[PDB]
Amino acid sequence: TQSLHYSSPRETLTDTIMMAKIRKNLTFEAINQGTGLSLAFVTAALLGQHPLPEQAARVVAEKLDLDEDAIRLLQTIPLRGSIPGGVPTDPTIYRFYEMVQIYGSTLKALVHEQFGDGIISAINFKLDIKKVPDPDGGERAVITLDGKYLPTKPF
Amino acid sequence: TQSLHYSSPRETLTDTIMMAKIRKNLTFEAINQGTGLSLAFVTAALLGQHPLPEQAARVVAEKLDLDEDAIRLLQTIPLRGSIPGGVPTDPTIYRFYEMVQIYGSTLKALVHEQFGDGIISAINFKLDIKKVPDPDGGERAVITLDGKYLPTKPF
Amino acid sequence: TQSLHYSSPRETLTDTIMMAKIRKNLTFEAINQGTGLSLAFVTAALLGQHPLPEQAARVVAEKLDLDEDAIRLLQTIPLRGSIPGGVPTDPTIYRFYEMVQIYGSTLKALVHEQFGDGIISAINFKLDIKKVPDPDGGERAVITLDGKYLPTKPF
Amino acid sequence: TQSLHYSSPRETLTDTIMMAKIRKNLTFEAINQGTGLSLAFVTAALLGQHPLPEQAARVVAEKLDLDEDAIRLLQTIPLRGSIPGGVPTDPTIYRFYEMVQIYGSTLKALVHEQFGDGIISAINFKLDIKKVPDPDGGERAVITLDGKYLPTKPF
Amino acid sequence: TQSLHYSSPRETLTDTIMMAKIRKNLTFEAINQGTGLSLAFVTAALLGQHPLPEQAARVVAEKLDLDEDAIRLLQTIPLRGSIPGGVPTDPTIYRFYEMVQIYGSTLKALVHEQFGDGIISAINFKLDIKKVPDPDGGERAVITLDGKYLPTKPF
Amino acid sequence: TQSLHYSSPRETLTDTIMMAKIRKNLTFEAINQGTGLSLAFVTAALLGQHPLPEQAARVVAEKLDLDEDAIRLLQTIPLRGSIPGGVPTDPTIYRFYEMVQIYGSTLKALVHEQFGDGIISAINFKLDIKKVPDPDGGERAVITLDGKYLPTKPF
Amino acid sequence: TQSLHYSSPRETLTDTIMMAKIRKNLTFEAINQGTGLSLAFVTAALLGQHPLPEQAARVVAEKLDLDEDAIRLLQTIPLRGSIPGGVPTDPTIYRFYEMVQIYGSTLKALVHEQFGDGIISAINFKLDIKKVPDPDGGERAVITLDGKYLPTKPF
Amino acid sequence: TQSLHYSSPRETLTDTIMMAKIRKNLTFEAINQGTGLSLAFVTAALLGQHPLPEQAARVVAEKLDLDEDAIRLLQTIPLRGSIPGGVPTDPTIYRFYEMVQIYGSTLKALVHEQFGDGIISAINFKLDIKKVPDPDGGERAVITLDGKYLPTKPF
Amino acid sequence: TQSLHYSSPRETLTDTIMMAKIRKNLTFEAINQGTGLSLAFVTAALLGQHPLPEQAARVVAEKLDLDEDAIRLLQTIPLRGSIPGGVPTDPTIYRFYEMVQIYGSTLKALVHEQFGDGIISAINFKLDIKKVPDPDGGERAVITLDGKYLPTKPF
Amino acid sequence: TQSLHYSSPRETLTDTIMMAKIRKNLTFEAINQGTGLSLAFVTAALLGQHPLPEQAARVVAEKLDLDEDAIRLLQTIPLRGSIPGGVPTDPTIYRFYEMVQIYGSTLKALVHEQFGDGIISAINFKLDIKKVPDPDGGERAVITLDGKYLPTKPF
């Protein structure tokens, strides 16, 4: 599996993808139909953060009119990172950034209390987002971060 | 309810709290017994990120030998933020920071697709962490971020 | 409703809008006539910070000679943020930045005193600017920031 | 009128003031009674961002048990700035920071359109915060920024 | 008068201006003949930091062979700031930056002693530079900064 | 003449000086009477930016009740720089910082046009502040930066 | 097992350890005798980057005269990170920093080629340093970084 | 041997190289066959961090369809550095960055203990990566950093 | 003599120069033959850091196939600075950067001890590089920094 | 020889050294008599950038009245770096920083032309400063940087 150490070719591909999606007024849910993969994984891949397996790349390529060069690039492992410079200003992204700023020390404390020394993985890891009704009217998003506990063992 | 615009008095209190917890070899779960509040909220408060109601402040104060000045400070709204300088280096905290760096644009995209313009709140918001078994051996942490959808409406 | 996680396409559209506005010597007030929306909101959208509803987008597009791709892009939710790098050097923008630097702790202190724990929203939010005469000669700007109070409650 | 070019002595006085306010469970509104000055100005002065005139300094000192060294220091012009490092992490302050990040270019645009070249002053300037009911239940903060227009004229 | 909230179109114009000036081997003094404006103001405008009024723009446009689009853009209020990133490395610019680094606290102290609380304006402001002989051989530059004092008064 | 490569000793001495100046209600002009040196030079020295000759160090020491250790430290060449971090937030200091941000490229252009390649010195340099009335009411500061021209010649 | 979200207490302990090591002229190899653990791990723990098991903590505490509070702190999981601000200036540390700056893209490229998508762990990880003779005279250091491959798999 | 002090021409060549490698679905191991040099060195050179000797440049050029301009550029000494801005966000590179962040002080300590004052070279230096089975299933990467010891000797 | 306040025109010219130098396989010493100027001065000019006198500009232009526009640009005083962002990552440049980081306070201390208050000039300044054999085998660079002492005198 | 990975204890020692040197009015030249070492090396060590061998430490300790704890700490290898934050503001240090900013690319270019690929060492390295008369009046400093060339060779 090929990989890139710089982001500019994948950012160009992502821009080609987004302009086709907006021109055709598609949803990510619709683009993902037939990949057999979870919506969050494929969306992240279309946005430049994961490789797609070849079959999923060709399924999404048919819906967005991508050429063979684009299909090849969609299968490459990218230089990951979706917030240029690390600190977002967009309010939607910032709220998730803010959760980590405020609750980061609590997450560390409770991980070590309940699991032990080590980390919760961001690689052996699954993300998903669910819309649920709010009991007081309106809607809520339940974002689930599901990661393997990897212990730190004295050697 | 009183508030502070600078963090040094609360950091001093947090250090008093942690040295009592380590000296007495207590868990956060044990300190929280009798508050009637969720473990994640009270842990964040002990770590300097929330005010406690007076009853919860006095319950935890009895377990950690805190004086009346400390009880008063525990009830104040703090200057929040738990990662000095915004960018963590500790690997445990960093993994949560990393999730937002990689999946931030995906979260934005799927929020706007499934909810619309606006944000998922970090204020009308609940966090919790659950330990569950991994089907392949080991354990996993399921962290749930549960926030109200607040729309952006043209005016 | 479509959205973008990166700013380059909306920055290009904004430049197209600004060069047409300058070539035609139009005002924002004149562009805004007949949009059904407030001048501050539509101006922010033209400058790349909000989506416009379809009919308002078509009204401004006719005055500025924009095509159907530009009309679609005007309706997309953007990656928000109008000050590259966060810190402005332009004196006009800097004064508003400076108001927050100097009065930020005062705002926090009085929000908590008069409302309680939590925030004043920048999303459930309206801005407007009004010109008033100064009694000592000259003119003043009255800028109104009108945000919903969102409480932080123990959970 | 004396002044300081560094913040540490004034930060010590602000800490002494906040610890007294919290000990006595006072409000800024109650501390301000009898100064004849606006709540936002006097609050900012107590938080280290303005000098107070002598009579106002003596009124607030009597409620906070300040001594003569502290009364003299409260009358000094400080090195202003209330957000260490410029970028806030506290959510309450951040929302006002975010307002400028999002609408900064819009404010510039409308200032130049409605007033002309130049700035809206942050010095010939008045700030106030008002609480009002939201018609849908809850409350809103109406923050007014009232600044003189100073034009940039070719010489 | 029109304005821009981003610098790229004006940077392009400034480049066109400088390339014609170097190609024609002109001085700013000669370009400024007949504008009715001072050399420092017009030089700053040509370098992208001020608008020119229409007739002065046409006077400089004739000497530099600029088109009507360029003339219109010369009349726009720019996004101001002449040092990318804020910190200069060029020795000539750095010396003026260094004067403020070293004497900044002295300037604050003496402004407050001789004028009072408030600022010396950078907008109600005139700059000029004169060359005078040095009595011990050589030449000196006398740069004069002439700014209005704007008091900070209790409100 | 002794020198220091770190600022903390002169920062402590500057604090000693300012606490005495405020306690005694002195002006810098009064402290400087009898040094035979310029107010701006001696003020900068008291604020940690220059050494004083012994005679001048003893004159200011008598006014401020400084001891022989402080007199020796006043004669030491300091590590210069009066704005921690380089970027000021205090409005009074920032205005002078802004003057360089806005007019830095103009200063460069006109130095090279009127003097040649090289720099205007900040070392062979004199600073002075004058207060003059403004015709429209109020007052203006005329700040004079007078520096040697030092050419850059090929080698 | 206890943990800390801030580094100040472990930095204090590390200083106590280092002053005893220097006063007693001990080596890390001698302190490590009888801990049952590897020299690199125990050295990192003494320098504030790992917890020690209780018995190993007592072994090193006896050699360095540490008390029971220090022994408890040695067993706490710390806030990890050994380079304040991320970027070292010390030449010895900088060379290892430089290896990553220069070869980072090569490491990523060869990890993906030889293992696949994912990471080489810094937690399931062992470090050791060995001294070997250089054939051309002198000595070399062979530093071994031994990390588990953690794949990124489509989900 | 020619060299460049800026990276953009070499970044263009690296892009041409990566697009060819991806188009032809080649491995670095396959590209390196016939150079007689180590895989890590040649990979780094292809990624823009080393010059290649002429014969090695011609061997890799033939597999990637490089022309004579590109062969000459591959032989030039580049401006080295593979992480724009110094701080990586890509998780694969970050783990190696994190190794230095955590163990940097330990490496310094053990270098000085086992070798003496001075540095472990990053120039007289060899890097290699080896894949080995993990006894518990899966695989590990053994990365060897092999650097000359250069002492700091008092002169 | 003309001057520029932005670097992009000389960066383009420097690229033109280096592509010709590499294509032609020239040395800087060969390019400089016949200018009557020092290799370090002319090399810095070619790399965008000085203007050349006309005679020298035409000598280098003939060797490099530069046209009359490039000759005019070579005579222009540039915006100086050769390390984007100030901090180099290239090992060759970094070593000189490191020399100042390590010995900066020593240079200050010894300048003030041996010369007095003031600076060693980087403007009235000459740089040169010599290669000499090392007694132990290999080679050494002797770099000479020769600058005017400029005293700081009270005013 | 012992070493430290943090700078605070050595900064404290350096302060003790400088206060005794200023109190006794000594020169570094006089302190260095009888050490057997060069003035630049010993000055750097006193300023916290090098260890001294034991007998030289005792020689300087006698002249500055340092204790046995101080003598031991003078012998430790420090965490090196003499400019907090990397960027100096002091004019005397800044001039040497500026020499590297301006001539850094020229130094790289000429090192590669005259030596080859690799670096000029900052560790196998000697620095000295000499005062020489200027033929046009005044004095100059000749600073010599003498570093070993370390080649970068293919492996």
Numbering used by the authors:
A (entry chain A), B (entry chain A), C (entry chain B), D (entry chain C), E (entry chain E), F (entry chain D), ...: 2 to 156
How did the manuscript describe this experimental structure?
Here, we present a new pipeline, SIMBAD (Sequence-Independent Molecular replacement Based on Available Databases), which can be used for both contaminant and brute-force approaches. In this section, we present three cases in which SIMBAD has been used to determine a difficult-to-solve case owing to the unwitting crystallization of a contaminant. All cases involve the crystallization of a known contaminant. Although the targets were ultimately of low importance for the structural insights that they provided, their solution prevented further misdirected effort on the part of the researchers involved.
Crystals of the contaminant protein (cyanase) grew in conditions expected to crystallize a cytokine complex: the vapour-diffusion method with a well solution consisting of 0.1 M magnesium acetate, 10% PEG 10K, 0.1 M MES pH 6.5 and hanging drops composed of a 1:1 mixture of the well solution and the protein complex. Crystals appeared after six months at ambient temperature. The crystals were cryoprotected with 20% ethylene glycol. The crystals belonged to space group C121, with lattice parameters a = 136.56, b = 94.13, c = 89.11 Å, α = 90, β = 125.49, γ = 90° and five molecules in the asymmetric unit. After refinement it became clear that this was the protein that had crystallized instead of the cytokine complex. Manual model inspection and modifications were performed with Coot. In the crystal, ten molecules of the protein form a dimeric pentagonal ring. Normally, this is a logical step that saves computing time; however, this case demonstrates the value of making no assumptions where contaminant origin is concerned. SIMBAD has subsequently been modified as a result of this case to use a Matthews coefficient to check whether a search model can fit into the asymmetric unit prior to MR. If the full PDB entry is too large to be used as a search model, only the first chain is used. This alteration allowed a solution to be found at the lattice-parameter search instead of the MoRDa DB search in subsequent testing.
